[PDB]
Design a protein around this nucleic acid. Sequence first.
DNA 1: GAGTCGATGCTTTTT
DNA 2: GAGTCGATGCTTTTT
DNA 3: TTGCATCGACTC
DNA 4: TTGCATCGACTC
Lengths: 93, 92, 270, 260, 274, 258
Amino acid sequence: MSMLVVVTENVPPRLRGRLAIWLLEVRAGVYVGDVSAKIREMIWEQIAGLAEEGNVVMAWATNTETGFEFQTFGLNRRTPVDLDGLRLVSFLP
Amino acid sequence: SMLVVVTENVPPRLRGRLAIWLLEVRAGVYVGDVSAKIREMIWEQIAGLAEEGNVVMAWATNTETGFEFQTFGLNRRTPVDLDGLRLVSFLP
Amino acid sequence: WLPLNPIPLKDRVSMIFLQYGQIDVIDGAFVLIDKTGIRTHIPVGSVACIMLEPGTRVSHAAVRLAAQVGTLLVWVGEAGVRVYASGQPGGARSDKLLYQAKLALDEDLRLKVVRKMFELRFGEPAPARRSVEQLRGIEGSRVRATYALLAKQYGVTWNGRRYDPDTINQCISAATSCLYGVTEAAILAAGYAPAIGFVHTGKPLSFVYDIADIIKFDTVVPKAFEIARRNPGEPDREVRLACRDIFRSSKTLAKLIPLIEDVLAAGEIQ
Amino acid sequence: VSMIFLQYGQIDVIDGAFVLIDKTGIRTHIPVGSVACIMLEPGTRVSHAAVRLAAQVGTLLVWVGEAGVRVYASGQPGGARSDKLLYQAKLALDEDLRLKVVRKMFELRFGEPAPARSVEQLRGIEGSRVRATYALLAKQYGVTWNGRRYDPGDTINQCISAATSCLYGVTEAAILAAGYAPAIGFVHTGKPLSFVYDIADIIKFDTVVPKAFEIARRNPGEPDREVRLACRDIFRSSKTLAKLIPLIEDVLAAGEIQPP
Amino acid sequence: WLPLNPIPLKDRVSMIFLQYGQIDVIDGAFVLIDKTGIRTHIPVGSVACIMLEPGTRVSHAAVRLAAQVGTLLVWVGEAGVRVYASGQPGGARSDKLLYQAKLALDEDLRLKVVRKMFELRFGEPAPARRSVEQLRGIEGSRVRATYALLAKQYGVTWNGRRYDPDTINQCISAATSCLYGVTEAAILAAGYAPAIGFVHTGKPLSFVYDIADIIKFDTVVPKAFEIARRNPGEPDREVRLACRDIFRSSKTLAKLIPLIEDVLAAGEIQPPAP
Amino acid sequence: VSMIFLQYGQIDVIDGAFVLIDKTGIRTHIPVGSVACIMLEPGTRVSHAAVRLAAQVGTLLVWVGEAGVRVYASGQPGGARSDKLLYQAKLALDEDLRLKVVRKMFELRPAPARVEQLRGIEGSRVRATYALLAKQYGVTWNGRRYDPGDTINQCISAATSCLYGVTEAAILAAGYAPAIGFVHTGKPLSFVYDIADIIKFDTVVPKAFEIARRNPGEPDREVRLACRDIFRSSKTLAKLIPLIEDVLAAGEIQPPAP
DNA sequence: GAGTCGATGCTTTTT
DNA sequence: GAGTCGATGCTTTTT
DNA sequence: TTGCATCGACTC
DNA sequence: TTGCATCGACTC
């Protein structure tokens, strides 16, 4: 069980509320919770299934090198990028 | 412990300064992994430089819900207490 | 957009109280709406039981959504105990309920079950060759002795178990109300029927009382006494928060299902 | 046995009685104790007081779709009356009582006594006869019929599937109103709606399925809505839910065991 | 808007490599800028060392900011070792540097320090009444024996320590380059001077070599051999990532400062408090 | 000893020599080995090649503000030349050599035949000197005040900040450590204060008074700019190195060669 | 993104 | 919020 | 008289 | 012929 954050942008209200079935909305499009792996993955399946033309990023705490890991779905100017196994963010122009 | 910080309508000074220590995965949303002392100094940074904008910070804890959070400045979305559980009320 | 499933009770917060507002569905989410137009998102799927207090008005949709995610709604009164509930239409497996029925129907298996219940209560096997009723006598006696002991321990005037159509009795009753809540939630999640009990029978929450009774005094009642110690205006809340704290701290939700399975297992049946 | 459908309004309390409220004011008064079971349809909200009162008189509240075409939730989860459920369990356990119920079920289904000899062969006969019945309705209504197909189909199969879904709705409603458990079946078993399938199956083909064929026919904007609405109107108009309870009681009665 | 401070090295990622772009400051943040106009935010304050590879161009502002947060910049060549560095103008406390100087200047204290260094290396106290040079000799011998042993262990042809104005030697050299990086970072963070060494002296990184040498073979060199085993086109990266992994996994950054303090403590003289 | 200031351009390499580049092309050629130390001012960028070359010839790169009015960073962190630093340490440790340096410092700034009392006499004169400049320039002066003030104290403070800048630059260029001081000690810029103090009042402070006079839109700016122009125009950084060498020399101990 | 205010439709099937 | 493209100014002092 | 970067104000 | 809620389109 580990801390989870999910950030949505231009996503349909269906998903907007559905994440809110299990998570708390502290600002628009930003959800925070604390979940087991299996729940995290089912949430991810929810997002992967319902994100239309919007895009979304999900990050959670881990016991890895940087302390956490993250993935996106859909397209964004801000995109993950690899520097020798460290994962950072490249800002597309 | 894992840290997240979310800024809105905050001056570029802070926008970049958080980026000295954190990673920006979307506009205004920073993620990291820090000790308590660093978390607090970051908070002091935010408290010091947030102008008219507003910002919310949450981190993982070993408490009842698993995490805890605070805001600075005003937002329609605001924390609210239900019998020791902390949730969020959406004003009009 | 299509799918939706319940999450394990294990992963949930025990329970949450809502008061003075309407609970509606907004864009597929469960929402509390105040008189001033305040929305409040509630993670229904992340809670085992939602307690509805007076002045609450529940949308059809809200109940349907609360059922789909396997969260029990329970209507509670002026500081009162459980008054009503709504949930999933029934057990998810015929097999489990039928298992419960066999165990229940023949008096010998029943005897085995109650014995184990007793063992689990007291840390001691029940005396040999005793009928069901006699065991229920022993229970009553020990229970009385236990109230006397906690009263003693915490320095609380205790004048018996007494119900109102006295502080101590309200604290106890509210605490038990909460526990009957979670116990019912677990029983339903496990796919069994709350009405089919072993010690208690013929009443709609017999099995709930049976199961709750087992862990009632290691868990929830001591603090009822400690809170009773304090003489506050509104007890209820502190009791509620304390029960939240005990359920998380002592892993109650996680343990409840295993306990039930072991209990029924003692029938020595498939 | 008495039950009422309430729709498009909030259910509250006036002088210890149930009341339905709209923008138009009071639409229906229901004096406490006049009804065993209240079916709440879409567009409704429930007052705290209403639930507290319903509990006081032990009234069952059941949240459903229009006319009970689906069941979403019920109060008194897992049945409120232990005795009825236990009655159902006895009947279900005993090999022989079970035989006897299923045979009665079969009798009630045709108006013919079932063949002498086990449960499985009757299962077979049913399958055959059912196929023959689909063929007959297809014939009667002039409908191309190409067999039983249902991956998670054809128009006819969708109409049928939706109608049966809806029938399972009302059948479940009745089963819960009667105070029995949907999971404990006699023909079908081991699955959450076994008993619902058992009972629904008996009166499937009198009304629900024929309309499925007629609608399949008329090849609409499209099927599922119209089928569901048509089933709604039939269930309300022909008092289906109410009539379902006697059938259930008789079926279980046949066990020749003391009903509570 | 006013303040800014360094964060403890303890909390940082060991090191990060940047290549082919310019590093600028944008709105008070440290940013890598590509030829196509890609920005990339780099948490400079969250790293102990930034390694600048060929084709990199560093803004004045970037260096000033990197210094303010106490992050060492190190210029590295074509797969090469450390070539240059830039940092904080000096030790934050006069006391610490002077402490280091006393220890260094008188040969007896120096003797004590080196003996402890030896002990820490081998898990054994150094022989009694031996001068500095002789301990140097023992080192050299033991070290050679250790390369031979790892070569043996991992099945690697080993033809000595050899250096280029051979795969094995490049892996070793790159690994040591990284380690000299972090060791220098730690030495500067602790507020001491890299040029004042005890075993090695008279060279700009004497103390860095002294300290790195202590933990070099329990940590960074074994994998140099294991990677050397593989015969790949571009070794460097795997070596870098492996060194990252070893530094985190074995708590290197956290341990480096205590080790240094204990080493200097062995002078039997009193350390200024932090 | 040789050093060059580069500004507003990128520093790169052409045929193994240092070059400064803008939009106009080449501004300055510097043949490798011609200079010991390069001071990089604001508005500059550094090529990889330039650093690799600077390392090859052991040239020190130092990132500074204009004219060295501040020091931001230096290559070869903690001093590159162990011998010079150790020389400084030897001098610093021995209370007697130390006495002897401080006395020389005082002379350069002959001291009375006895460190602390000299501290006292300095404080007194210094006050007297502020009073004198206030007099000379017609400036209201109400004493030593500095809390983190009056106009005069801000101008003074900013000027001294800037002087500490160039003094630090020189100290690092000479290859010594700013933290090891003789009068001031125990703090990161002790030696910088020691050396700056000697030539504080010839040039840096007088202008602080003149600017304090003029009561400008912004003193700190003007003071800093004025100090920049004075340091460049009067070769201050270059002249600081001999002073330092003589000061430490006075220990009568063998300086290392170059 | 988040208000409105019109539109629609109480529905995401199967034994 | 994040582009532009003009403005400014290489600066957040103290021993 | 050259330049890197923060800060403005006005439309996406 | 009453109502709760999703989904549109058009300006903050």
